[PDB]
Design a protein around this ligand. Structure first.
Ligand SMILES: C[n+]1cn([C@@H]2O[C@H](COP(=O)(O)OP(=O)(O)OP(=O)(O)OC[C@H]3O[C@@H](n4cnc5c(=O)[nH]c(N)nc54)[C@H](O)[C@@H]3O)[C@@H](O)[C@H]2O)c2nc(N)[nH]c(=O)c21
Ligand SMILES: C[n+]1cn([C@@H]2O[C@H](COP(=O)(O)OP(=O)(O)OP(=O)(O)OC[C@H]3O[C@@H](n4cnc5c(=O)[nH]c(N)nc54)[C@H](O)[C@@H]3O)[C@@H](O)[C@H]2O)c2nc(N)[nH]c(=O)c21
Ligand SMILES: Cn1cnc2c(O)nc(N)nc21
Length: 358
C-alpha cells in the first residue's frame, strides 16, 4: 500500500482541527541542556515608536559571534519524550488519552501539510507504536545529508541572519530592549507543547516558539506568541505573488499548527539589512492566494495530513518500540512504506521505554 499526494484528491471541505491548547513548555540552554521551564523564552520588542525606521544589520557578528548547534548530533524526539515522561500523569483528556494520540514535532507535521505542493524536498518519517501511542520521527534522506554537508556559505550565513533578526526584535525580559551585541547561539530554544486533534486523530506535539508579545491584547498562550521571519525585499507584483504562492504556504503551515497567530517579517535588502517590517496574521495568509489558479489551499494541506495520519495509524498495527514503519516520499510519487527493526531506524530510547513500561 501507498498514499497519493495530489492536491486534487484533497480539495474537499476543511477538516476538523482542534484549537490548540498549550500543555506545557521546555527550554534548551546554550549547551543544549534541557530545562523544564520557560527560561529560553524571549519577548517581542520592536523598534521604538516615532523613531527611525528599522535598519537591522543581519550580517553583524557573522561568524565570530555565531555558535551553531551541532547538526551531527541526532536528537530525534528525545527532548519531547523527556517532557512526556515528566508529565505523563498530568496530561489532559483523561485516562488513556495518550494511548490514542500521535506524538511528534510541529516541524514534521508542517512537512506533511506542505507535501501536496512540494516540488523540491522529499522526506522520510519513522513510525513506532508503543503503548497505543503512535510516534513519528523524521529520518534524514541521502539528499538531505549531502546538501547539509555541502551547505553553501551563503546558506549558512542566511541561517545566521534569520536568528540574528530574532536578536534585533526580542528582549530577555518583558518591556526590555534588544541587545544585538551578544552571541547568536542556536543551541538555545524555547518550545511549546500542545494538544490538538486533526479529524479523529488526537495530537501531542511541540514546536519552537520565537517569542511572546507582551503588547498583545490576548495574553494566553499560544495567542500571545509571535513567529519571526526574514525574506528578501520585493518590489513588483510578480515578486509578491511568488512569495504568496511559495513562502507564505510554509509560514502558514508552520504557525497554523501550534496556533501562533502572527508572523512578523523583516524584509532584507541585498546588502543584508532589514529595512522594513510587516505583520502577517496567520489566519489571513490564505487570502492572498484564495483566487489564485497557482495558489495553495489550507484544506488540501490539512486533508492530506489527515489522510497520512489515517494511513500511518492503519499501517502500524504492531505495538513495539523497536519496530519502525518508515514512510518515504519524494516529489512526483506516492508515500511508500518499508519495515525495519532496531538500528539505525528505531528511535524510542530505552530510558523512555523502560520508564513507561514500569
Ligand atoms: C540504504 N537506504 C535504504 N533506505 C530506505 O530503506 C528502504 C527499504 O530498503 P532497504 O535498503 O532497507 O532494504 P532492501 O529493499 O532489502 O534493499 P536493496 O535496495 O535491495 O539493497 C539490499 C541491501 O543493500 C543495502 N544497500 C543497497 N544499496 C545501498 C546503498 O547505496 N547504501 C547503503 N547504505 N546501503 C545500500 C540495503 O540497505 C539492503 O540492506 C528504502 O526504500 C529507503 O526508504 C534508506 N534511507 C535513507 N535515509 N538512507 C539510506 O541510505 C537508505
Ligand atoms: C528540524 N529541526 C527542529 N529541531 C528542533 O526540534 C524541536 C522541534 O522544532 P520544530 O519542529 O518546531 O522546528 P521547525 O523549525 O518547525 O522544523 P523544520 O523542519 O525546520 O521546519 C518544518 C517545515 O517548515 C518549512 N519552513 C518553515 N519556515 C520556512 C521558511 O521560512 N523557509 C523555507 N524554505 N521553509 C520553511 C521547512 O522547510 C520545513 O519543511 C526544537 O527543539 C528544534 O530545536 C532541530 N534540532 C536539530 N538539532 N536539528 C534540526 O534540524 C532540528
Ligand atoms: C527560514 N528558513 C529557511 N529554511 C527553513 C527551515 O527549513 N526551517 C525553518 N524553521 N526556517 C527556515
Amino acid at each position: 500500500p501507498s498514499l497519493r499526494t495530489q492536491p486534487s484528491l484533497y480539495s474537499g471541505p476543511f477538516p476538523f482541527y482542534r484549537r490548540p491548547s498549550e500543555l506545557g513548555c521546555f527550554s534548551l540552554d546554550a549547551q543544549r541542556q534541557y530545562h523544564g521551564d520557560a527560561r529560553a523564552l524571549r519577548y517581542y520588542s520592536p523598534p521604538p515608536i516615532n523613531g527611525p525606521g528599522p535598519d537591522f544589520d543581519l550580517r553583524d557578528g557573522y561568524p565570530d559571534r555565531y555558535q551553531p548547534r551541532d547538526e551531527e548530533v541526532q536528537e530525534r524526539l528525545d527532548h519531547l519524550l523527556r517532557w512526556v515522561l515528566e508529565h505523563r500523569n498530568q496530561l489532559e483528556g483523561g485516562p488513556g488519552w495518550l494511548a490514542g494520540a500521535t506524538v511528534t514535532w510541529r516541524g514534521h507535521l508542517t512537512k506533511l501539510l506542505t507535501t501536496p505542493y512540494e516540488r523540491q524536498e522529499g522526506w522520510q518519517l519513522a513510525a513506532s507504536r508503543f503503548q497505543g501511542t503512535l510516534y513519528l520521527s523524521e529520518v534524514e534522506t541521502p539528499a538531505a545529508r549531502a546538501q547539509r554537508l555541502a551547505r553553501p556559505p551563503l546558506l549558512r550565513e542566511l541561517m545566521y541572519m534569520g536568528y540574528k533578526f530574532e536578536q534585533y526584535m526580542c528582549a530577555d525580559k518583558p518591556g526590555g530592549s534588544p541587545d544585538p551585541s551578544g552571541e547568536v547561539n542556536t543551541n538555545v530554544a524555547y518550545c511549546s507543547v500542545l494538544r490538538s486533534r486533526l479529524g479523529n486523530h488526537p495530537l501531542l506535539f511541540s514546536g519552537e516558539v520565537d517569542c511572546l508579545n507582551p503588547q498583545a491584547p490576548c495574553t494566553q498562550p499560544p495567542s500571545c506568541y509571535v513567529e519571526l521571519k526574514t525574506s528578501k525585499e520585493m518590489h513588483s507584483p510578480g515578486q509578491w505573488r511568488s512569495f504568496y504562492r511559495h513562502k507564505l504556504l510554509k509560514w502558514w503551515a508552520q504557525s497554523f499548527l501550534p496556533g501562533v497567530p502572527h508572523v512578523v517579517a523583516g524584509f532584507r535588502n541585498p546588502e543584508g539589512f532589514v529595512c522594513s517590517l510587516k505583520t502577517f496574521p496567520t489566519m489571513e495568509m490564505f487570502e492572498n492566494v484564495r483566487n489564485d489558479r497557482e495558489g495553495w489551499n489550507p484544506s488540501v494541506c490539512m486533508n492530506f495530513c489527515a489522510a497520512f495520519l489515517s494511513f500511518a495509524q492503519s499501517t502500524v498495527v504492531q505495538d513495539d518500540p523497536r519496530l519502525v514503519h518508515l514512510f518515504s516520499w519524494e516529489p512526483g510519487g506516492p508515500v511508500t512504506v518499508s519495515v525495519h527493526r532496531d538500528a539505525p531506524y528505531a528511535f524510542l530510547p530505552s530510558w523512555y521505554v523502560e520508564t513507561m513500561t514500569q
